[PDB]
């Protein structure tokens, strides 16, 4: 392919021999989840993120649908694939660095970052819906939509990311995969269709407009998308639940967003706006 293939020693090298502590305390791990760790590296003078793969076969193929996807995809809300390490003892995949991390991450503070403003929550609802719509017309089904996959780069430009379980509605499977929070009740099935992307996009867009995450078994309702239940029978209003830590949300674009995190959140999947109607939708709130 287009993309370089790295010694398994010069990964090592430029990770601090893949430095388990985090990055607050001068190691080189950034991130954990998607079958793997992610580490900060430097190769040549330029910042990278690796992602060490750790079923065997069952690893290699998501490591072989990654590189497949990224060959296919390219576009400015996706992230960039440089190159992969297949040689030493471990799966290598090398990605040009996020430095503002996981949506996910940015959303709840970590590490003392300050509160995303209602403007730059716009742009990157915005930018995640420009990439899905991307993949959904490259016939790509991501399947596992959430804050955790959305990067944001150094202007905060939103990048979908983890295409390992990808699929290039009407298929079925004996593997149900993805992140309960987010799925759609079709998906929880085993169905295989673009429209459950729509769903998982619908919890994103609740979780950008009130910062909490989409499950919290501390919480009541412990799942964010029964919010939507909430405010529909009046208990709740949208006013209630907006984010705290914000000083420049008004009230006309939140309702505007709501209303197409409502709309992708049918629990009918032929009812759910297309992903083209949810980037018009968001597109006519600003
Ligand atoms: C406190 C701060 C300085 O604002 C933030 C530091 N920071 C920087 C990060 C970069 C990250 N990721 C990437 O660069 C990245 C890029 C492309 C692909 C992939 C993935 F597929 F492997 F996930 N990860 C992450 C994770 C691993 C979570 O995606 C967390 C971070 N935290």
Redesign the pocket.
Known sequence: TRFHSFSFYELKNVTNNFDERP??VGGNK?????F?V?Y?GYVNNTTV?V?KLATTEELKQQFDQEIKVMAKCQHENL??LLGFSSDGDDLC?V????????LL??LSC??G?PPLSWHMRCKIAQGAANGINFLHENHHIHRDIKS??I?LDEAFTA?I??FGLARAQTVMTSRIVGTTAYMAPEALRGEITPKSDIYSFGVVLLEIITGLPAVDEHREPQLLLDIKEEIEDEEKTIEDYIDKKMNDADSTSVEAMYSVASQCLHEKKNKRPDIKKVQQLLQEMT
């Open positions: 990055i607050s950034m991130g954990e989840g998607g793997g992610v900060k993120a992602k992230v960039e995949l990605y040009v660095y996020m430095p503002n991390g996981s991450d940015r970590l590490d970052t955790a996959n990067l990048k990311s983890d």
